[PDB]
Every structure is written in structure tokens, then in C-alpha cells.
Amino acid sequence: IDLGRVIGELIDHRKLIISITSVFTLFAILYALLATPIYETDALIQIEQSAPETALLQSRMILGKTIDDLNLQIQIEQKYFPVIGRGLARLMGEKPGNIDITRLYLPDSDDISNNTPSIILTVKDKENYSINSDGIQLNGVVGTLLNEKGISLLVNEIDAKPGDQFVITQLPRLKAISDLLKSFSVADLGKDTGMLTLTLTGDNPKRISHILDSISQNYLAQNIAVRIIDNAVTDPNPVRPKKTIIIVIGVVLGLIVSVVLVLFQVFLRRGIESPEQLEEIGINVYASIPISEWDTLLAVGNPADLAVEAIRGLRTSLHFAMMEAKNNVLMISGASPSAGMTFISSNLAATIAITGKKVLFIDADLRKGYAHKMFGHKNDKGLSEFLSGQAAAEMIIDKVEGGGFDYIGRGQIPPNPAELLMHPRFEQLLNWASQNYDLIIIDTPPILAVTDAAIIGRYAGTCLLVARFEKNTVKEIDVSMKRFEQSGVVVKGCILNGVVKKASSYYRYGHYHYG
Amino acid sequence: IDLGRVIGELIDHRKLIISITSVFTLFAILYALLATPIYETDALIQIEQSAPETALLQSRMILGKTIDDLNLQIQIEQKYFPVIGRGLARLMGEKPGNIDITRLYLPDSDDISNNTPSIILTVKDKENYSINSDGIQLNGVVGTLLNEKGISLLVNEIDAKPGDQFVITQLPRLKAISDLLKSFSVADLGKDTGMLTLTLTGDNPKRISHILDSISQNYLAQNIAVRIIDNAVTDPNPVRPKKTIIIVIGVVLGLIVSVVLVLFQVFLRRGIESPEQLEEIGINVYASIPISEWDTLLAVGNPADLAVEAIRGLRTSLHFAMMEAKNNVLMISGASPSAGMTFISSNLAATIAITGKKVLFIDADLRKGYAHKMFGHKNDKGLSEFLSGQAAAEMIIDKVEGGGFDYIGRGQIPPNPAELLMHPRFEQLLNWASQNYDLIIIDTPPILAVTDAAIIGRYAGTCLLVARFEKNTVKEIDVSMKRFEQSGVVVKGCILNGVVKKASSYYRYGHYHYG
Amino acid sequence: IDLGRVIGELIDHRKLIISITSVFTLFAILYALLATPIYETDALIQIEQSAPETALLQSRMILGKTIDDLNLQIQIEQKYFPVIGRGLARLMGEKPGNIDITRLYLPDSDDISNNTPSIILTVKDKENYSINSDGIQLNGVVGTLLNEKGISLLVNEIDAKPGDQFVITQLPRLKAISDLLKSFSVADLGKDTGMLTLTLTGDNPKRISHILDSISQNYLAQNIAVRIIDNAVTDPNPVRPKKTIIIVIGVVLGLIVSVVLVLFQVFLRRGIESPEQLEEIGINVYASIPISEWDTLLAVGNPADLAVEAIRGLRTSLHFAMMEAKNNVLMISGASPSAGMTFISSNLAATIAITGKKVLFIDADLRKGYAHKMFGHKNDKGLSEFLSGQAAAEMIIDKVEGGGFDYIGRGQIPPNPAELLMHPRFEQLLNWASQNYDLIIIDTPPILAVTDAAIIGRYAGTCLLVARFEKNTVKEIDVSMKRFEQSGVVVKGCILNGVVKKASSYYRYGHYHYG
Ligand SMILES: Nc1ncnc2c1ncn2[C@@H]1O[C@H](COP(=O)(O)OP(=O)(O)O)[C@@H](O)[C@H]1O
Ligand SMILES: Nc1ncnc2c1ncn2[C@@H]1O[C@H](COP(=O)(O)OP(=O)(O)O)[C@@H](O)[C@H]1O
Ligand SMILES: Nc1ncnc2c1ncn2[C@@H]1O[C@H](COP(=O)(O)OP(=O)(O)O)[C@@H](O)[C@H]1O
Ligand SMILES: [Mg+2]
Ligand SMILES: [Mg+2]
Ligand SMILES: [Mg+2]
């Protein structure tokens, strides 16, 4: 491989690359803007050692004392239903509410799993509130204590707007101690001095400084039954989430996944990409037809279409190839369905009719031929009725209205399509038509699916295959050619159909307007 | 190899891959949900050293003292018959039962192996219970002590539902001490401080905390004849089993075993996969017939089957190959049995009869021919009776009912099949039939097994081999061709039969419906 | 690749290389001259240890004491609207202003984000000033204190020119302490001695020395409730930005980006560069025409142009190639539009007419032919009107004025250009003209876009393609030749047009003046 190939591949897949990178970067931005910020407070302690003091600070006696002093076993969480409600509320500038609770005693359900009882408190005004544990609604008032239904509560100084809801949990003392220990750090910072740096993290910048001051006071008071050089203050800039590294990670991750996905698609492609793939195998390509982005004949509705220009190129190529052919019959076939055989056949018939030659178009697709719909029809008396013997050769020929050539439709779909085509009446029809017309074009079903084209091809002096631009593979076309050669039918060459513009190609068609 | 191959192989084997990975992941989930959880308790001790204290804590004097205090030599296990009964009971929310036993003395059988006597106690109510050691049933009551049959028991505070059974074992003191020592850990956690961290694991979160408190008290009391900073508490989250790592391991193990199994099957395949394998060796393939998923002729029951379409393709190929043949006799044979020789022969005869040609089908498989069953028969007077001389050429020919061609059945199975076929009456029959029919098709046994086809092939102007899609190998077909060539029989080519859709193939047949 | 190639590439791209390097170096110089200089002060302290003193110096008690003493919570910033205003003002020699403020109390808005209140003070004279916080304009006087609108201010010794504006911020004490800590360093410098080196950086060389003296005095005074060997002095040479390394980095970065960009363009080029690329494929090149940097015929306006000399070379080559041609008709075509087909065709006609031969020029580009504009026209009765039958062969021929040859214009643009050219009247016209002229030159549309040239080429004894020097590729020309060969038209060879001078080429044309 070379760099031009990969650059063209990136240019072609730019829509997917951009979409994937933008999606990943949007998710990264949403996380870096909706994650709750985490602040850090710290304090500095003087030791007159300092290895066992580190274990004494993190022990459950000191931390438990702090938790008892500060009532850290009463967890209060402002309620937002979604997982992004809190982040949005912070972004909108809404001030978070808080409640001071000095006494809480839940009935302590203490079942197998839920060791932490919790209730929901809804604020009705600055004074009263509603409480529900499991649907049991009670009304309480700030100030006066509540002792009802096995529930004790004392609420002071509700500072929020009415309608807010708060989850109040009474978690066990060990759970509180473990929570405090997880966010608490002690370090020496000199490895030999009596200086210890205590650190604490949390989402409330005032609460963490109060908690660290309590820890320092408890440790100092316990030791004298040590000097606090720096009492706890909180850095106002949150330490998490780290926004810029998150966004950079998101962008780079999006780019790498996009690149590997494009590499995956490029390594898994097998369709035809240029006429050179067919010409390596030894197959003549007579034209490349682009997709016309424009029940009508294209060569009649839009004669100045680019696909019709490419078909005029095919017309001039054929006028030279079909010299020294045994008769004036051309058969168009292909490997797979919806490659474009009917499109090519009918539009070629129209462009050859505009030059003043008499053209007969035969729809010999007895299984799915729709040419009568595309030309305007009297669907009675098609090729079926003629072959089965219930029609004559003069009742089946009709005129294309905006075209200028004659045609024969398929007729009624028969039960034995391949066997009807083997009747000698088919060759009688071809020999009769070959004397009243300058050209006969026969449209057929694909050869890999059924065998009708190989029957028809015995009486055609020229045979061309239609290959679809991206769908078909080189192996398909080669197998189709060999299946034709085995039945005694020589295939003159190929027509590539439905070509589109690709930056990776480096093959230049003339698929652009000139005028 | 290239990535497209391996991706196609994975697509083809996806059923096996998915099944294996799902089985392994289900087993991993069952283990991670049924393994008994193991909790951890820990405590913190202050040393005013700390290297020999680690050996003193783990010594048998202190641990034995703890065991004597807590009666850890009385093992009580709630009885579940299966190895998943306890896990299911925990999952169903059933509360485990417990019994407080303060005095236990089993008769101490003390045989060669079973040093641990054990009895089974069945709860009948909150007060009384039944006891059985070796079938000896006794009744006891909570409170009053039991001294009977050399068995002493004192049970207090049965807390369970009636019908529960408990195994009560009296294990030796050293066994209890070793059990305690296995789950007990001591560490320094500072490597120089007087701080020791004691840890204990077990399935009962309260029992382990009691045991660790007992150990700490015994060590402290013995030393003063040390400060306990943190008494034992249990982390409520079990430390084992670690569910997520178990499930991840199960998934990754399933994926790796699936991949190696698929790689094993791919490296061990030798059958034919595409007509290109036969065409490399120099063998013409005239058709590829798919499996028809539809005692009847397929070309008559379901004429619009895909296999019948492929056989019409073979019919058109043969109409061109059999030109310039010495006579109108076609022989179908093959390498191995049940490749499809009778299927191809009979369905080809039907599709050639629908085109209005007179066809004779001869079942020259004198060893296992069943064509008379498939056509509707008068089994008398087949080819056997004609060759052996006890029938004429006009009594053996019959009509296929839904077909449209004549046929000759095998007749009665003879004892000398190969020698009957060598009679000049066989060539007389063929020469007579060659003037009353347009085509004669002869179905034969496989050539690797027996030699009858090589005898028949002397009088056939065309001979084709049938290769089964996945069963046969290229070597088999080449050996069959060479065995035919050695006997003076030229094989025109091959028919691949029973082809199916494979994502790894990258060879495109036309085996899809068009209509 | 070899060194001559890369050197030629650099010579060719020197304009881009120089421009990019100069841009990057200009940006580096602008940064190294506009970044605010940062000075460094330092002091030396004697310790009679020195590990905990390092943590005591950087603690918030000592630094906070310094900030309280020096009023470092009053931030004063001289206001420049742009991000380069301060640098320009320093470069112009303008002396920065300063104000001594001893008392500041802002109303402390203290909203969600803006924790730092700030006001703007505009100097009106040496005595009075104007103050605005949020549009509230107040007048104050140096000396007398201001207590108005919840704002307290005391300003002393305004030393600046009138019209200056200063931002006065009251940042929080922790923010001031963090700012001081970020620019403050302590080191031991001997790792064992009682010598400590204190360092401080900042943009004001006097303020930082005062701050470091305050820190040293506070630490010394606190310890005695230590010897200061060196009091703080400031190095007069700024430590940042480091100009020379910045400029060197800019230059080297510019060079590397230029080199990679030129390498990118060289690896992405696919156009034709020399006639050897076409001659490898087997295509005869008959001339290489340079760009003429000079609605007129070039061979008439500037006959001594270099392009006309190259066209005289083509004339002599053609006089030898067109011997043994079937007729005296030459067709010029090409692959893509604006390759130069009309330029070559018309100028070749002029140079052949000056030698005394009778020349007919036919503009057979019925879609975009403009030759009538370039020759001076009576636009009526062109080739369209003749082919459609509404004009005779004697009314369509006109004289080029400054030329010397006859010509036929296209006529009115028809709706069916390709089909008009297929009329037998075209061959009648060519056969009639072939007897009254020595040479007929036909100009055509490009062959990849439309098919008209392949129709015209049947009646031309000689056909040449024009390839554009850098635009066309070898693949394009080869595809054009093969499209012509498929239609039965033999292409004699190619003309390379619009060649320019490239140092990387190492192919020498004769494109220089001789005279
Ligand atoms: N180059 C093309 N540009 C635009 N439409 C096309 C082109 N080729 C085929 N088609 C349209 O795509 C559809 C499928 O092609 P069709 O010719 O009918 O398939 P088939 O090969 O089975 O005969 C048709 O509706 C056809 O008109
Ligand atoms: N492509 C096929 N699709 C469906 N059934 C098939 C196909 N080929 C063979 N069979 C069936 O499989 C069985 C074995 O094949 P058969 O022709 O009787 O074997 P043999 O080669 O020994 O003569 C038969 O019952 C046949 O009808
Ligand atoms: N070697 C050249 N030097 C200067 N001008 C040129 C040269 N070749 C072509 N041109 C001018 O560039 C323009 C495009 O070329 P033109 O011959 O008209 O294109 P086309 O190939 O489509 O017929 C014209 O205006 C032409 O005069
Ligand atoms: Mg079709
Ligand atoms: Mg059989
Ligand atoms: Mg032009």
C-alpha cells in the first residue's frame, strides 16, 4: 500500500470519520460538564516518628470520634430523578439546598440486604415538610421534634425552595467510617520531618474543611491525654473531573476507532472498483456507465444526462465491435439481478433508434420482465403467448411512445420459462425479425440464477455482460463468462454500470458535464 | 491466510461459538452466584519489636486458649443434600438457622480414619429434637441435658424452623487450631511501628468478629502476665467470591476455547469446497447443484425448486457437450456412495423429458438400485432377468408416471453382478435402445467400491462423475478419474452436488430464487 | 529516491518553504518581544535540620502573615485593551503607572462563580479619579477616604498620566496565598548545611524583593518566639521569556513543518511531468509546448513566442508522420477539457498556413466551440446548419483575417450533437474539402466526456491527443487511447502542452530563446 491510497480512503469515508469523532467528543464533553465536581481540603500538622501517627490518624477510634461529633451518619442527598439532573441543575445556576438535621432515628428495618434505612422528605414551605418512608405520609414542622410511627426526626433551618425532595439515610457507623477513610489521606511530605500533610476530598467544599478540622482537633486532643501549623482550607478549584484531559482522550479515542473502522471496511471490500480489475482477467470493458441521480426511459426524459452520454459512447463502440458478426442480434445479460441489464438494454435501444436505425427490443425475461410497464403496454400477447403457440408474430410487436423503436413484451408469466425458450419458434421469430430490422436487442435474466440466457445466446451474434459497480466481484463475472463458454456462447465483453466518484480510485472516467 | 477467510469462518461457525461461550459464561455465573460468601474482620493492635509477637499470636497456646473459650471444637453445619442447596437457599432469602451448643461429648469411635465423630440433629419444634448417630434415634429437649448411649449433649436456643437437619461434629483440638490458623493473618503494615493488623476470614460475619476479639483479649491478657486500638469489626461486603473477575474470566475462556476449536475444524477439513478445487486439477465442472430442502421425483413434485433450476443448467451444458459423441448414451457415476448419482440421473431424465425428447433411464445398479421404488414399479423382469436370459427386451421397459420417460429397473438382485454386465446381451440392449430413443441415461454404482461402472462405460459415449459437496475430496475424484482412464473409459467431467451456503467460500453460485 | 530529486524539489518549493519559515519565525519573535518579562529575587538563610523548615516556610501561617503585612490581597493591574498592549507600551519606552492603595473594601458580591470583586479606576489628574464597578460612576480624591455605595477605598500617591485606567481586584486571602506559593521556592543548596536559598519570581522587580524580605523577617521573627545571611535582591536580567531558545525553536519548527509539507505534496502528485512517463507506456510524444506567458491567435500576434517555436517543431514532425496516411485529415483531441486542444489546433493551422499550403480548420466542437470568436466571425451558417441540412458547403467557409487559412465554425449549438455528426453529410463535406485543400484540421471535444471525437475519427487519416502538463495523468491518457482503439480509431500519438520549468525535472526541453 501507499499513502495516496490511504488518503483517498480517508477522503471517501470522511462522513463516517467525522460523525464518529463528533459523537465521541460530544460524550466526553457531556461527561466533563455533568460530572459532579470534587474539591480538596488540606491541613499541616507538626510532630515533635510520624510513622505510627499515620496509622493512628486512619484508625477507627479517631475517625469514629469525628463522625460522632459531626453526625456524619446522617446522609442527606438532594433528589434528582435522572443521572444528569444534578449536573444540569448546577449548570443552570440553581443553588443546591441543604437541611440541618441534629437527630435521626429510623425504625431500623435491618433486613437481609438493606442495612441502611432511608426516608424521603418533601419541602412544603420554610416551616413544615412531608415525610414518607414506604408510603406512610407524615407532616412535620421545623423546631418541634417528631416521634411517630417508630420514627424520630429533628429538622432545623430548612434552606431550599418548596417542592424539593431530599433522601435522608441513616447509614451504619462502620459505613460512615469507611466512607470517611476512603477520601482521607495522610502523608509525610519530607519522609523525615515532623510535618504531616492531611488531605480530604468531597463534593461539599465547606463540609470537608469542617471534617478535617474535626479530625485534627480530635487527634491533637487525644495525643495530649503535636502542633497544628495549618488548619484545613479548601482549594476552590475542583480536582475532579479533569476536563481537558478527558476531552483530549475522547477526541483521540474517536479518531482511533474511526481509523480502525475504515481500515476494517477497506480490508473487507471485494467488489469491482475499476475496469482494470476486469481487464487484468482478460475481459474487454466497452463502457462505464455512471449512476444517473435524475417508469420512464432516461434516454428520452433527460437525453443530456451523463449516463446517456456514456451510453452513446457504448453505441459507438458497438457499431465497430458488431462488424463481422454472424447476425444483427445483440444479447445483454449479467451475473446477478439488479445489475442494470434492463436499464442498459432499453436506453441503448433508445440511443440507437435516434440515429435513424430500425430497432427491435425483445424482453426475453419470462420470469420478471417489466419492460411493458416502462414502455406503455397492451400486456396481452407477449413472447409467452407466441412461444406457447397461441399468438402470431404480428400481434406481439408494439411501439415505444417516446422512443422510436419496436418492442416485444414478455407476456403472461409461464410455468416453464426455460422450456418455452427452447422451442424452434424462437429461432423462427429471430430469423424473421432479422430481415425487417437493422438491430435486435434481447434482454435476459441473469446467468448465475437461471439458464435462460444460455439458451437465448445460441442465436445471438453478439453477447455482452453487465457488471454492477460495487456489488459484483471479479470472480462472479469470470464464473458467468465460463458458464456461458461451456454452453457454446462466446461473450464479447462487459459493461460496468452504476459507477460513482471515489477519491481512492485514481481512475478517471469522463463522468462530468461538458457544455 | 487473510482476514476475509477467518471472518467468514467465524460467521459460519457462529452457532458453535455462541453456544460454547454461553455455556461457559452460564457456568461462571452459576459459580459466582452459588459460592458461599466469605467475610473479613480485622483489628488493630499497638506494640510499645513486633517480629516475635507475630509468631506468638499464631502459636498454639494463644489460639488453643481462644478455641477453649469459644468452644470452636463443636462444628455445626446446616444440612443441604446437594452442593448447591445452600446457595439456592441463600438466594431465595431463607434465613440460615443456628443452634447454641455448650456441651458435646460423642462416644469417640476413633477408628483408623474417621477421627471426627459426627451426629445428625433434626428439629421437631422450638423445644424438642431428634438425634441420630448411626441410626440410633434419641429424643432430646432444649434445657435438660442428655447423657445417653455414651453420648452427652446440651442444646440451648434452637432458632430455626421444624424439619431442619444439622450435622454436629466434634473435631479434635489440633484440627480446630489448624482451621483457625488457616484463616488468620497478622501483618505489621508499617514494618517498623508498634502497629499490627490482625485479619480473620469466614462465612459467619459475627462469629469471626467474636473470634478475633477473643484472640486479641487473650494475647493482651497473656502479655500483661500492648494496646488494642481497634477492636474487631467485619466488613459487610464479602471478599470472596469476586464476581466480576470470575465472569470476565469465564467469558474470555469461552471465547478462546471457541476460537481454538473453530481453528481446529478449519485446519482439519479436506472435502471439496468450490468447483475451483476440481478445476485446478484439470477437471471440468458442468454444474453445481444445491441441497433441496424441500419416494418422489423432485423435478416433478417441485419443478420450481432451485436444484431443478441448476439441473436445467446442466441440461443445457450437456446438449452442447454431447455433440460429436459416438452414441446417445450417457453414464452417470461417482466415487463414493450417496454422493447423489441416482438423484442427478433421475432428475436429469425428467428435465430432458419435459422438452419433448424420448428418454430411456436404465438402473444398472444391480447391487443397491432402488429406482423402481421411486418410479412406481412392477418389480418383475428387470435388467437382471434380461441379462441372465430369462426375459426379453420388451418386457422390462416401463413408464414413469409423473415423469414422461421410460425406464428399466434393476430386477432381482443377482449373485454375480459384475459378470452379468459383461454379457454381450448388454451391448445388444444398448444398440437396440439407441435407435428407439433420443437419449439413454445409465445409473451405476460408485467406481471406488466396485468395478461395474467401468464395464458399463465402454458402451457409453459420455460419462460424468458426481462429487458430493463436502464429503468427497479432490484426491478421491482424481483417483476415480484415473481408475476410469485405466480401463479405457474417458470421463468428460464432474457434477458437484449438495452445495450449501458458506460465508467463508467467496464463491458465488446462483442458488437463489428469481421470480 | 536520490539527493538530486529532493534538492530539486526544495528548489521548486522554495517560495512556500521560505514563506512558512518566515511566518513561524515572525510569530516567535513577536512572542519573545511581547511576553511580559519575569524577574527573580533571592535570599540566603542560615539554619543552626532544614527539612521541616522548608515546610514551615511554605505554610499558610507565614505566607498569610506576609500577605497581611504587605496587603497582597489588593491586586492592581494597569489596563490595556489588547493582549499585546502591555508589550507594545513597554517597547515604546512608556513608564508603567502605579497606585498605592492602603484600604480596599468592595461590596463582596460573592455570586456562584465570581468570588473576586473588581472595579475600574480612571485617572483624571494627579489628585482626583473616577471609579466604576458596574456602571456606577463615583468621584474620589487622593487623601480623603471614600465610603460610598457599600464601597470603601483609600488611594495614595497616584503616579501616572491622566486617562490611564486600572483594574482593582479584591481577591480572597487563600487566592493570594496560593499565588504567592506558586512563585516561591525553597532549596537547601548543600543538602546538609544550614544554608537555605529562597527564591521568588514576578514581573515587578522591587515588589518581589520586598515580599521576600517580608517572608524572611516573618520566618526569623516567628522562630525566635536562624540568621539571614543574604537579604533579598533581584537579578536585573529577566529569567523569562528566554528569547534565543524561543527564536531557535521557532526557526526549527518552521523548517520541519515546511519539509513535511513539501514531502506531502511530492508524495501526492500524480500528473504527467515529462514525456518519458508517456513513452514508457508506449505513446509517441511529438512535441512539448511550453506555457506562453504573453481572442487572438498567438502564432499571429507573437510569431517569435517560444510556444510557436515548439509548434513549428510539431509541424516538421507531422510533415513526416502524415506521409502514407489515407487522407489529408488531421484530428486533434484529448482526454479532459482545457488541455489545450483548440490552442494547439488553431496555432498549428496558422504555422502551416504561413508555409504556403492551403489549410481548412473545422471547429467540430458542437457543444462548446468558440473558434468563431477567436477568428472574427459571421456566426450564421456553421457546421450545425450544414449537418441539419439548412446550409450548403459554400456558405459556411470563412477566412481567418490575420491567419491565412479557411475555417468552418460550429454554428448554432444543436440539441443532438453526437447524432448530427453521424450524418453521411459529414463524410460528404470531408471528401469535398479533401480535394480543394492540402490539409484539414478538425478540433473536437475531449473523448472521456463525450463520444463525438470517436465518431469524427473514422474519417481522419491522422489523430493526435493533447495532454496537459500537470493536470492529466498517465492513466487518463492510456484510457483515452484505449477508448479510441475500441471504436476503431488509431491514435498516432500525443502532444504535451503547457510545460513549465521545474528544478526537480532533470528533463531538458528547448524552451529558451535563441536569437
Ligand atoms: N446507472 C444507473 N443509474 C440510475 N439507475 C440505474 C442505473 N442502472 C440501473 N438503474 C436502475 O436501478 C434499478 C435496477 O436495475 P435493472 O436494470 O432493472 O436490473 P436487472 O439487472 O435485474 O435487469 C432499476 O430501477 C434501474 O432503472
Ligand atoms: N442436492 C440434493 N438435494 C436434496 N437431496 C439430495 C440431493 N442429492 C442427493 N439427495 C438425496 O440424498 C439421498 C442419497 O443420494 P443418492 O442419489 O440416492 O445416492 P447414490 O450416489 O448412492 O446413488 C438420496 O435420498 C437423495 O434423494
Ligand atoms: N501552452 C499554452 N500557453 C498559453 N495558453 C494556453 C496554452 N495552452 C492552452 N492555452 C490557453 O488556455 C485556455 C484553455 O485551453 P483550450 O485550448 O481552449 O482548451 P480545450 O482543450 O478545452 O479545447 C485557453 O484560453 C488557451 O488559449
Ligand atoms: Mg431486468
Ligand atoms: Mg444410487
Ligand atoms: Mg476546445
Automatic annotation (TrEMBL), chains A, B, C:
Q: Where is the AAA domain?
A: 339-452
Q: Which Pfam families match?
A: AAA_31, GNVR, WZC_N, Wzz
Sites where the protein binds ADP: 290, 292, 338-340, 342-343, 370, 468, 497
Q: Where does Mg(2+) 2 bind?
A: 342, 365, 443
InterPro entries associated with the record: AAA_dom, Bact_polysacc_biosynth/exp, GNVR, LPS_length_determ_N, P-loop_NTPase, Wzc-like_C
Catalytic activity of the protein? L-tyrosyl-[protein] + ATP = O-phospho-L-tyrosyl-[protein] + ADP + H(+)
The record lists the membrane-crossing segments as 16-39, 245-268
Q: Indicate the segments forming the Polysaccharide chain length determinant N-terminal domain, all copies.
A: 1-70
Q: Give the record's keywords alphabetically.
A: ATP-binding, Cell inner membrane, Cell membrane, Coiled coil, Kinase, Membrane, Metal-binding, Nucleotide-binding, Transferase, Transmembrane, Transmembrane helix, Tyrosine-protein kinase
Q: Identify its membrane topology class.
A: Multi-pass membrane protein
Q: Name one GO molecular function term.
A: protein tyrosine kinase activity
Q: Which NCBIfam families match?
A: eps_fam
Indicate the family of this protein: Belongs to the etk/wzc family.
PANTHER family linked: TYROSINE-PROTEIN KINASE, TYROSINE-PROTEIN KINASE ETK-RELATED
**What is the name of this protein?**
Putative transmembrane protein Wzc
Q: Which organism is it from?
A: Escherichia coli
